[PDB]
Amino acid sequence: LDIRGLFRTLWAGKLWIIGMGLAFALIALAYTFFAR
């Protein structure tokens, strides 16, 4: 398990992770406001 390389891999692609997490949070917000 090359965790040292894994750190660089996750550092390089952090923008996509943050954007998709924010999109998922927005979807959750919409579902919450669409519920009883």
């Binding site: 090359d2 965790i3 040292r4 390389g5 894994l6 750190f7 660089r8």
Partner: protein, 36 residues
């Protein structure tokens, strides 16, 4: 009258947060070995 507070038990918080910080710092240092 209680002699000691139940919260936030400063010593336990110090120990736990220091252990967590040391673990994550060791992980960061390990990940930096292959960065060179």
């Amino acid at each position: 009258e209680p002699v000691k507070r139940d919260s936030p038990r400063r010593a336990f918080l110090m120990i736990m947060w220091g252990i967590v910080g040391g673990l994550i710092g060791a992980g960061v240092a390990l990940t930096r070995r292959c960065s060179k």
